[PDB]
Design a protein around this ligand. Structure first.
Ligand code: 118
Ligand SMILES: [Mg+2]
Ligand SMILES: [Zn+2]
Ligand SMILES: [Zn+2]
Lengths: 465, 1338, 98
DNA sequence: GCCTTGACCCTCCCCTAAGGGGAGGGTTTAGATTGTGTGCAGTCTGACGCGGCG
DNA sequence: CGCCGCGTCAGACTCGTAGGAATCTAAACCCTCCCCTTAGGGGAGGGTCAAGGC
């Protein structure tokens, strides 16, 4: 396309959308709102396996009268306890049921945007619906291994009848030998189908009404999603016009844009058109919040917490005006007196605001000598020290041979020489069954002999450290 | 231990099995307590502990528990060194493309899928779709779409087809394809379309698919899903003094990847619109590309100081990468440097070393020696004794350095005599003292230079420093076999002043008993050094079987030569000292002393010469004054007599008699002549102008002027510089190259003007600027030569060939420039040559031609010998000792195990800084010989020949060719063959602006083959009235007329074409445009009459172009095969030409532009190789048409043409080594059951040792052709990827070696230098050999 | 200037350079050429491993020299291992085969 | 000499009553505002290989 | 097939010195965890000081 720049590639794919007018955003928000309540409608007459609000009003048990908070919850359930008495009559799809449960929907429409409370009721069937799905997958991974059979008669009448296994009698009807080529495995089909039939027991309702109105419940959750998408896609110029005042502060342009878009996606989710204000006035807050939060979390090699960021910024703002006013830079005393903090903290803050230098920094007249060439390894031992360590080990091994073997084993155990660990008196006397005190006696013996001048001046040579 | 190195692509499971855990966030370290944050880039749970045997919290310590893993902080208790070995990884949220396998041309993805790079770079930016599956539809695999066409296909076809976008699409394409089926269907469907343009790409794609199938790789691993992370200690974060930190750039580049991958993992959970997820995937791709190779696919990401960040690929490649900076040369311990100065009292094996330098460099030796004598109890007391500088320390130091050699080195090291081993002598002071005779191999002097000192530590290094590198084994040069220790500046002046003579010297006439009496008389004050006397002298010789026989005589000589004779050793003749000696005579002395006596007498004799030269130069008293520069008294008149001429040649321009150009070009030479007159007057007034009188009266002798004495002896100076001191300076050039008109008529003894000085500064700066900007070209050429030649080593003793090359002298360009003796000395004879009779055998036919054999060849006269060469050696992977010949620095047959490639490269490269960057007469009398000839008698009683390529040679008294020319075609030879003519006689006459082309036989000329309206005019010379039908230019062209190119032909009394004796030939030739023909119609001519006529950078660049095998921009055209020539189908893009064998097929005909004047007419019969035009020849054609020896001979002669023009001497096998290395590849023509392809390029040794085994058990082998590659294209085409990767272009080498799946066997010298092993050459050759034997054992 | 031992750099662990740093002398690329034109293989193997860059050998050599035993035991240099790591970090699988 | 008592002694860590002070982390904020911007860098010459268009 | 455009790769070695590293705005509210405060208590674990039994 004759270009490889991704900022132009973005600003080009972003310009194929039109800006909205004051009525466009209102009637987009209206359908965003009514799809999410069409869903809440569809959740209404699902069986008691849902987490329905019977005692959610009691689970929790603008400051509204307690008598108002206790009473208006009695309207809905006062009609609901008598309404779904008709769950039995004429199957599961009775028309009085649709009429009065969409009258419960007439009641339901009153409400508007809410936290994940509503979410946790539709999840009430998530954990239950896909379950059903996956179980009828199991039957299939138990049929295809043994026999091959055309799927569009079987699964079609599977969708249709759901009364009993009598639809398998529709498999032999065409009189081809693939009818009962299956042998000794159909009880596994009956296994999984029977377990989902006891799932049907706990639900009490057949699958082709639950999935039937889930087909229309999925219409609301998609029709809200699509309107949210085209409410987001029409406002990207706002993000791009805000995020151009945060440049040269540690992030690149497209990073700031992709941080602003995640805030716009929340301003779209929290909007309320009834309050009468435009969309820009509410969205700018979330856009700026996202960009500001990402500048303080990224964009430093060594990360500083947010409270220290605000302290640094405040001290910069004070020193600017004191420099404009005095004509000089103020000493930390003149900053402590006005910032009203203890001077040691003002001295502590002033060290934390420096970014590490690159190891490729050219140092000299040329550019073949770098800063990283003159950096020395500090954790190495000098060879004079290695030789000294080995010579001292040999000298000690020679002096430890003069005195008794049993009387040197105790020194080896007591100072840990040639062993994996140091030991204590009682655990050494464990193997000697000698008293707590005799060990100390023989140690004061050995250490008294070992400094007699017939022996000491070979080891004394080392202690000039 | 290990034996090889492999390279391949890395799967995701391989990258996950190198790692110790996943990096999840950009945290480096805590800002208050600088400890590594968990799961960040410096994490101590993944990468290891930051202190020895400590966890991070502090719970565990003290090396009791060594394998425990702390439960609080997860760090295991171990040593911190492991933070240099452990790696981590990053799991990417969407696959990305590796930039190397996409954008290093040719792209491997576009070559594997057969897609253009534009389509791939459009699918990778979410800018177009691509069809993966066709289903059952009109769309097919790899079809490209746009969004609208994708929507149309969706609403029209639905689910059946499959189209994707981004690197997931490309991974699906690479993953779905089948390689074996595809390559086999490229096999049988190439033979129809095996046209060349398709042939090249089809065979390239075939070998790529076959490489992927055999190597084991999978094509989809070129798309990344897991990323590795380098260990933390190789990209450190380090505190400086002051609390400031410093960091690497890979940290900056890893953080961007991590926190653009995390954001995509967030957006894929918020379920955002796709316009935003696409922007994230693009940003992630760009970030990974900048981490791998920064500036390759766009703009380079820069840091907060506006410099581009360095990447993982910039740390490997280039002049400052790992390879050239840390692996091929290092910094070392036990070494120092200092200023050098001269010590004149030293022996040749000795250097002076300061006491303090030696005390520092030798510290552990002194510690051990101190505590062995019991002088110190422990090493830490020895340290303080040494630090206090007690008196016994200086006595331990003197016996430590006793018999411990020391290596000295001065940069730049142009050849191997730049590092030499000496024995040290402790001195006071701080400068190093160097012997005055080794300053010529070093190129050193004492205007401020500095030298480096190195100490060998082990027993083997000491043995090698004594036996191989000591300065008393290095007296000969390894480029030519000449001595290198010749005396330079004051040895020469002192020896020259002591062996001169003078007239009427004090003490003239006496008769003395020997040299001792002459010395005793000179010291006493009774005689002079220059006095003519008679002395009795005893001298020795050896003709016995190793014994010396003496003889005495009385000789006439001077005192000084009798004094000098006490230095010369026993066995040399007196005639070497009886001259007045100079630099050349002294070099001759040293060389004959080396030839007769040997090495050790030579190294004693050189020292004695140095001492006595210094002593007598001191006693002479030579000085320089202002009166020693004598200006001739008749310069002032030569100057006026040139100025008068330039005035009277200006006034022939002011009156319109001469042009401006000729006026300038005449003033130039009338000033040059006066300059030459002044210079010769000056030099004759100075050279013998001494009138010293004798017993009765005056006479003349050579001068004792100081300047003349130091110029004539060869100590310092020349005539060209005394010319500027005492003559005039001359003519100056502009910076353009133009010469100014008025010259500089002054000299340095008299002083220049402001203007003469100003115009003299131009050339000074031009020279100073050329030097500095030429040194770089010379160094770069040396590096390429070393890289092509580095792995060639003498491997065997005798290969057993009978091939060779024919050595003759070079006699062109004038007199004999190179005798035959200088070109066979040291070589081995290829066949049993015989002195010019018959069966004069001198040979077991393997004969090292040492000096006695060359004398035997020169007492007879033989001028061609067949010798042995390396370009014809039959040994594979090396040369044999007999094809190489003599070791030019040792004087005997080469030893097996020698590194001849590095020596060849260094010898050719070292002198590169001195490179600049109408009728035949006969001199002496001898026979005249002709070759390549075909003759005819003339009408005027002379000889003519109808050969174009003949040769005319002059034969000496005995039959050795002394001069050789070639005559132009059509020329009339003044005299015939077999004549003994004297000098001063012309033998052939040709026109300076014309050459005629003659008839074949006496016949009757007809105007035919041309009409009016043709390329012919009727242009008759109106003043003289002579005109034939004249051939025209293309400006007077009539295109419809050139149907037949005009020529006037010869007929019989039959009216038809004449017989030619021997063959049924057409007697006449058709000539190209603009021919001058004025021969009458109806006026007939004889055989050989004038029918028609023919009207009409050196230095380092040329050497580099010869070794790089460039193609000239006007290459001559040669005959592909032998056959009768004719013009072809005449398709008029430009002219067509064909040749036709008398028996064979002739599909070969090709294009020639009409600007290219042809020299071969339609009746010619040509043989394979001869020219169809003129122009510089191309070496690939010389290798294709003629053999290997022809291109070898051409290259070595054209290279030596440049070196000899400057006075540089290089032997000729040093160029043959390079030519052998440029010929290592072969190309297959017909496989024939040989497991090779039909136009693949293979190594020549592989083909050779395959055919030697196929043909062994009765089978048909392969047929091939040889190739010629330049030095830098043959360095890169070798079969080890480590040498090639460390030479140049590391990216291409590594990507190709990676997808191919190569391995490396570590057989050269550089491979073993990289990994720190013993090289296979020299004292390491035996070791490797033994190892190779175990390769046969297992 | 002269140096027996001293300080080593951080990444590659070779001697530092300069007189102000008490540094070693560069044995450059064209001095290795001279040394392998002589055929001096042991001098070169000790210039590369135990004088410059081998970490265990350069401390074992010191304690052999103090004890009057002029012998070395060379290993593999450190910059080769650095090279292998930086090539593996590009996605390429390079290894030493035995 | 080769062991057993009964006294004494030391350092290190955790604890008391009623909060105080700070470090480091979470969340929202409703008049409207809708396409970058540096007062860029662009700056060498020669050889070679391949694609795109006549 | 041929010419031209355009993109990639290369350009000597060893030493010296030279301080510091360069713009750039959010504010009110909540929570949990960790150490601090007087003047000594309490225990755990590990050492030391005389005295005899044999
Ligand atoms: C410079 C420019 C704007 C703000 Sb503000 C703000 C700050 C304090 C009190 C009220 C408003 C802001 C909002 C969210 C995140 C970061 C900063 C602000 C917001 C919308 C419109 C105008 C100003 C601050 C400094
Ligand atoms: Mg000098
Ligand atoms: Zn721990
Ligand atoms: Zn041979």
């Amino acid at each position: 396309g004759r270009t490889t720049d991704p900022v132009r590639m973005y600003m080009r794919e972003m310009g194929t959308v039109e800006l909205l007018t004051r009525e466009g955003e209102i009637d987009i928000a209206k359908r965003i709102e009514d799809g999410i309540n069409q869903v809440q409608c569809s959740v209404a007459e699902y069986p008691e396996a849902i987490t329905y609000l019977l005692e959610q009003y009691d689970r929790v048990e603008n400051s509204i009268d307690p008598e108002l908070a206790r009473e208006k919850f009695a309207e809905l359930r006062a009609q609901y306890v008598v309404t779904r008495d008709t769950i039995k009559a004429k199957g599961r799809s009775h028309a009085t049921a649709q009429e009065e449960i969409l009258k419960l929907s007439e009641v339901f429409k009153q409400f508007r945007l809410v936290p994940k409370q509503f979410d946790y009721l539709v999840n009430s069937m998530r954990v239950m619906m896909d379950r059903v799905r996956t179980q009828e997958r199991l039957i299939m991974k138990l049929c295809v291994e043994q026999c091959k059979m055309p799927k569009k008669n079987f699964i079609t009448l599977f969708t249709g009848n759901e009364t009993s296994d009598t639809w398998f009698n529709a498999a032999i009807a065409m009189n081809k030998p693939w009818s009962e080529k299956l042998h000794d495995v159909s009880e596994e089909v009956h296994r999984a189908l029977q377990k989902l039939q006891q799932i049907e027991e706990e639900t009490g309702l057949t699958i082709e009404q639950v999935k039937d109105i889930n087909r229309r419940m999925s219409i609301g959750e998609a029709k809200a999603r699509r309107a949210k998408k085209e409410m987001v896609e029409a406002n990207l110029r706002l993000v791009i016009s805000i995020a151009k005042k945060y440049t040269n502060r540690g992030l690149q342009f497209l990073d700031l844009i992709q941080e602003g878009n995640i805030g716009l996606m929340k301003a779209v989710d929290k909007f309320e058109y009834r309050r009468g204000y435009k969309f820009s006035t509410y969205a700018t807050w979330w856009i700026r919040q996202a960009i500001t939060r990402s500048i303080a979390d990224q964009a430093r090699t060594i990360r500083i917490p947010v409270h220290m960021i605000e302290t640094i910024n405040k001290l910069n703002r004070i020193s600017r005006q004191m420099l404009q006013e005095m004509g000089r830079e103020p000493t930390p005393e003149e900053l402590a007196e006005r910032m009203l903090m203890p001077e040691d903290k003002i001295r502590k803050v002033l060290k934390i605001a420096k970014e590490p230098i690159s190891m490729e920094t050219p140092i000299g007249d040329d550019e073949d000598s770098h800063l990283g060439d003159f950096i020395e390894d500090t954790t190495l031992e000098l060879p004079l020290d290695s030789a000294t360590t080995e010579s001292l080990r040999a000298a000690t091994h020679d002096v430890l041979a003069g005195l008794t073997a049993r009387e040197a084993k105790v020194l080896r155990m007591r100072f840990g020489i040639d062993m994996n660990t140091d030991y204590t008196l009682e655990e050494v006397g464990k193997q000697f069954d000698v008293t707590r005190e005799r060990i100390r006696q023989i140690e004061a013996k050995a250490l008294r002999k070992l400094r007699h001048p017939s022996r000491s001046e070979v080891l004394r040579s080392f202690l000039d450290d | 231990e290990f034996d090889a190195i492999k390279i391949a692509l890395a799967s995701p499971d391989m990258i996950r099995s190198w790692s110790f855990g996943e990096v999840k966030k950009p945290e480096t370290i805590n800002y208050r307590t600088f400890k590594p944050e968990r799961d960040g880039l410096f994490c101590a749970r993944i990468f290891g502990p930051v202190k020895d045997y400590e966890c991070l919290c502090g719970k565990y310590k003290r090396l009791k528990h060594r394998g425990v893993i702390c439960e609080k902080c997860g760090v295991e208790v171990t040593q911190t060194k492991v933070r240099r070995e452990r790696m981590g990884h990053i799991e990417l949220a969407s696959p990305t493309a590796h930039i190397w396998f996409l954008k290093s041309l040719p792209s491997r993805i576009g070559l594997l899928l057969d897609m253009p790079l534009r389509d791939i770079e459009r699918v990778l930016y979410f800018e177009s779709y691509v069809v993966i599956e066709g289903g059952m539809t009109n769309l097919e695999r790899q079809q490209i779409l746009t969004e609208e066409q994708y929507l149309d296909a969706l609403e029209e076809f639905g689910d059946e087809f499959d189209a994707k976008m981004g690197a997931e699409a490309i991974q699906a394409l690479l993953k779905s394809m089948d390689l074996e089926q595809e390559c086999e269907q490229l096999r049988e469907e190439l033979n129809e379309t095996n046209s060349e343009t398709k042939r090249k790409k089809l065979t390239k794609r075939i070998k790529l698919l076959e490489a992927f199938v055999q190597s084991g790789n999978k094509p989809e691993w070129m798309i990344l899903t897991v990323l590795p992370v380098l260990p933390p200690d190789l990209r450190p974060l380090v505190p400086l003094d002051g609390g400031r930190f410093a960091t690497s750039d890979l940290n900056d580049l890893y953080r961007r990847v991590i926190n653009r991958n995390n954001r995509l993992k967030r957006l894929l959970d918020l379920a955002a619109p796709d316009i935003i997820v696409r922007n994230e995937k693009r940003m992630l791709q760009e970030a990974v590309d900048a981490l791998l190779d920064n500036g390759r696919r766009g703009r380079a990401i820069t840091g907060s100081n506006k410099r581009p960040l360095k990447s993982l690929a910039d740390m490997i490649k280039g002049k400052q990468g790992r390879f050239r900076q840390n692996l091929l040369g290092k910094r070392v311990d036990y070494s120092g440097r200092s200023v050098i100065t001269v010590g004149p009292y030293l022996r040749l094996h000795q250097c002076g070393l300061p006491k303090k330098m030696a005390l520092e460099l030798f510290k552990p030796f002194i510690y051990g020696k101190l505590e062995l004598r019991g002088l110190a109890t422990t090493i830490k007391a020895a340290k303080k004794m040494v630090e206090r500088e007690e008196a016994v320390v200086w006595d331990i130091l003197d016996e430590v350095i006793r018999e411990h050699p020391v290596l000295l080195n001065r940069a730049p090291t142009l050849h191997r005599l730049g590092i030499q081993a000496f024995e040290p002598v402790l001195i006071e002071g701080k400068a190093i003292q160097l012997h005055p005779l080794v300053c010529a191999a070093y190129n050193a002097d004492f205007d401020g230079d500095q030298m480096a000192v190195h100490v060998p530590l082990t027993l083997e290094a000491q043995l090698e420093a004594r036996a191989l590198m000591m300065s008393t084994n290095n007296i000969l040069s390894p480029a030519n076999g000449e001595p290198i220790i010749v005396p330079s500046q004051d040895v020469v002046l002192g020896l020259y002043y002591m062996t001169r003579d003078c007239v009427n010297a004090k003490g003239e006439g006496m008769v003395l008993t020997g040299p001792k009496e002459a010395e005793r008389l000179y010291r006493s004050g009774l005689a002079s050094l220059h006095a003519r006397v008679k002395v009795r002298i005893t001298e020795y010789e050896k003709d016995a079987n190793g014994e010396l026989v003496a003889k005495t005589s009385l000789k006439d000589t001077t005192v000084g030569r009798a004094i000098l004779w006490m230095i010369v050793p026993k066995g040399l003749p007196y005639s070497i000292v009886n001259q007045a000696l100079g630099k050349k005579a002294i070099s001759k002395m040293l060389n004959t002393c080396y030839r007769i006596l040997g090495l050790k007498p030579t190294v004693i004799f050189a020292d004695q010469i140095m001492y006595t030269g210094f002593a007598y130069a001191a006693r002479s008293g030579a000085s320089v004054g202002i009166d020693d520069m004598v200006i001739p008294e008749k310069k002032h008149e030569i100057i006026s007599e040139a100025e008068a001429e330039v005035a009277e040649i200006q006034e022939q321009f002011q009156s319109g008699l001469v042009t401006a150009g000729e006026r300038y070009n005449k003033v130039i030479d009338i000033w040059a002549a006066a300059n030459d007159r002044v210079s010769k007057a000056m030099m004759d007034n100075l050279q013998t102008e001494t009138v010293i009188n004798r017993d009765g009266q005056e006479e003349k002798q050579v001068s004792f002027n100081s300047i003349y004495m130091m110029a004539d002896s060869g100590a310092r100076g020349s005539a060209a510089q005394i010319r500027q001191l005492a003559g005039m300076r001359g003519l100056m050039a502009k910076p353009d190259g133009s010469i100014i008109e008025t010259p500089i008529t002054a000299n340095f003894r008299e002083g220049l003007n402001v203007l003469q000085y100003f115009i003299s500064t131009h050339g000074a700066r031009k020279g100073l600027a050329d030097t500095a900007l030429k040194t770089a070209n010379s160094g770069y050429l040396t590096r390429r030569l070393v890289d092509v030649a580095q792995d060639l080593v003498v491997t065997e003793d005798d290969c057993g060939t009978h091939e060779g090359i024919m050595m003759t002298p070079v006699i062109e360009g004038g007199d004999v420039k190179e005798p035959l003796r200088d070109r066979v000395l040291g070589r081995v004879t290829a066949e049993d040559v015989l002195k010019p009779g018959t069966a004069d055998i001198l040979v077991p036919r393997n004969t090292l031609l040492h000096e006695q054999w060359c004398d035997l060849l020169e007492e007879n006269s033989v001028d061609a010998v067949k010798v042995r060469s390396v370009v014809s050696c039959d040994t594979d992977f090396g040369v044999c000792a007999h094809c190489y010949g003599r070791d030019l620095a040792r004087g005997h047959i080469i030893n097996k195990g020698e590194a001849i490639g590095v020596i060849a490269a260094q010898s050719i490269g070292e002198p590169g800084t001195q490179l600049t960057m109408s009728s035949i007469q006969v001199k002496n009398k001898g026979s005249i010989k002709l070759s390549n000839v075909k003759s005819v008698v003339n009408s005027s009683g002379k000889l003519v020949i109808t050969s174009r390529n003949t040769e005319l040679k002059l034969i000496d008294e005995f039959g050795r060719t002394k001069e050789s020319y070639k005559v132009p075609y059509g020329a009339v030879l003044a005299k015939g063959d077999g004549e003994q003519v004297a000098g001063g006689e012309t033998v052939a006459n040709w026109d300076p602006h014309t050459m005629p082309v003659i008839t074949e036989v006496s016949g009757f000329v007809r105007f035919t083959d041309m009409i009016d309206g043709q390329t012919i005019t009727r242009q008759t010379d109106e003043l003289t009235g002579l005109s034939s039908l004249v051939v025209l230019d293309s400006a007077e062209r009539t295109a419809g007329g050139k149907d037949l190119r005009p020529a006037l032909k010869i007929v019989d009394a039959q009216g038809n074409d004449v017989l030619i004796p021997g063959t049924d030939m057409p007697a006449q030739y058709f000539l190209p445009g603009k021919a001058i023909v004025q021969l009458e119609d109806g006026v007939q001519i004889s055989s050989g009459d004038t029918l028609a006529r023919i009207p009409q950078t050196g230095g380092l660049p040329r050497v580099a172009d010869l070794f790089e095998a460039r193609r000239p921009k006007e290459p001559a055209i040669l005959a592909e095969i032998s056959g009768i020539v004719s013009f072809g189908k005449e398709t008029k893009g430009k002219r067509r030409l064909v040749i036709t064998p008398v028996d064979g097929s002739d599909p070969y005909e090709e294009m020639i532009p009409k600007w290219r004047q042809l020299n071969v007419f339609e009746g010619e019969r040509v043989e394979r190789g001869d020219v169809i035009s003129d122009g510089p020849e191309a070496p690939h054609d010389i290798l294709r048409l003629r053999g290997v020896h022809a291109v070898t001979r051409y290259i070595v002669n054209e290279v030596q043409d440049v070196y000899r023009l400057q006075g540089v001497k290089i032997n000729d096998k040093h160029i043959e080594v390079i030519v052998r290395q440029m010929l290592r590849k072969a190309t297959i023509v017909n496989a024939g059951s040989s497991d090779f392809l039909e136009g693949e390029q293979v190594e020549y040794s592989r083909v050779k040792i395959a055919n030697r085994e196929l043909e062994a058990n009765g089978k048909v082998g392969a047929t091939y052709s040889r190739d010629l590659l330049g030095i830098t294209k043959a360095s890169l085409a070798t079969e080890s990827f480590i040498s090639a990767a460390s030479f140049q272009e590391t990216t291409r080498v590594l990507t190709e070696a990676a997808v191919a799946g190569k391995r490396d066997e570590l057989r050269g010298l550089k491979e073993n230098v990289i990994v720190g092993r013993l090289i296979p050459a020299g004292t390491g050759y035996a070791y490797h050999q033994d190892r190779m034997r175990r390769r046969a054992a297992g | 200037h002269a140096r027996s031992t001293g300080s080593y750099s951080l990444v590659t662990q070779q001697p530092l350079g300069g007189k102000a740093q008490f540094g070693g002398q560069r044995f450059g690329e064209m001095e290795v050429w001279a040394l392998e034109a002589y055929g001096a293989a042991y001098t070169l193997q000790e210039m590369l491993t135990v004088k410059s860059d081998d970490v265990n050998g350069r401390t074992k050599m010191y304690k052999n020299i103090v004890d009057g035993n002029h012998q070395m035991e060379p290993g593999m240099p450190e910059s080769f291992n650095v090279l292998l790591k930086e090539i593996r970090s590009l996605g390429i699988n390079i290894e030493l085969e035995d």
